[PDB]
Amino acid sequence: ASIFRCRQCGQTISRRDWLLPMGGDHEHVVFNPAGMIFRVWCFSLAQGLRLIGAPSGEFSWFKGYDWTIALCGQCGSHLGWHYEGGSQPQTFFGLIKDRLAEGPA
Numbered sequence: 184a185s186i187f188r189c190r191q192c193g194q195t196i197s198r199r200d201w202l203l204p205m206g207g208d209h210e211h212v213v214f215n216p217a218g219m220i221f222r223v224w225c226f227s228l229a230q231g232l233r234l235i236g237a238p239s240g241e242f243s244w245f246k247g248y249d250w251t252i253a254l255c256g257q258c259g260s261h262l263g264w265h266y267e268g269g270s271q272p273q274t275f276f277g278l279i280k281d282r283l284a285e286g287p288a
């Protein structure tokens with residue numbers, strides 16, 4: 184259990200090796216303005232995503248970061264967000280834990 188794939192289609196997304204403890208934890212439980220709760224895992228790196236639109240700072244869960252919606256590049260499932268425009272690090276991924284499947288390389 185070291186690779187993360189899209190739960191809907193099996194697209195390769197990320198690795199346990201690429202987890203990032205942002206503010207001391209890789210897990211952040213957050214809500215959007217529509218009151219939806221997400222258990223977000225922070226990754227330094229991800230692949231197989233498609234980033235939609237241009238970055239926004241509105242309602243960012245991470246101070247100093249703008250977000251873009253990250254879809255599965257294969258099936259279009261909403262897997263989380265790319266964060267940019269910040270510092271240490273400049274960029275990272277917040278992926279919704281329950282939309283990933285963990286398994287062998």
Ligand SMILES: O=C1CC[C@H](CS(=O)(=O)c2ccccc2)C(=O)N1
Pocket residue numbers: 214215216217241242243244245250252264
């Ligand atoms: O750090 C973040 C990521 C984005 C998220 C909003 S969202 O991606 O849920 C969304 C997008 C467009 C219309 C409604 C809601 C949020 O509140 N905070």
Ligand SMILES: [Zn+2]
Pocket residue numbers: 189190191192193194255256257258259260
């Ligand atoms: Zn997918």
